[PDB]
Amino acid sequence: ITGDVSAANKDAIRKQMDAAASKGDVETYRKLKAKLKGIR
Numbered sequence: 001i002t003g004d005v006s007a008a009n010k011d012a013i014r015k016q017m018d019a020a021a022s023k024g025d026v027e028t029y030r031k032l033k034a035k036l037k038g039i040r
Contacts, residue, residue, distance in 0.1 A: 010039075
C-alpha cells in the first residue's frame, strides 16, 4: 500500500520535529510545527 496515510505521515513529522528542533536544525523545526498545525 504505497502512500502512507496520515497515520504514518503525522507520526513521522512529530518525531522529526522533536529531533529537528533540539538537534541544530531549529530552522525547519519552527516551520515544521506550522505544517502539522495546518494539514487542512
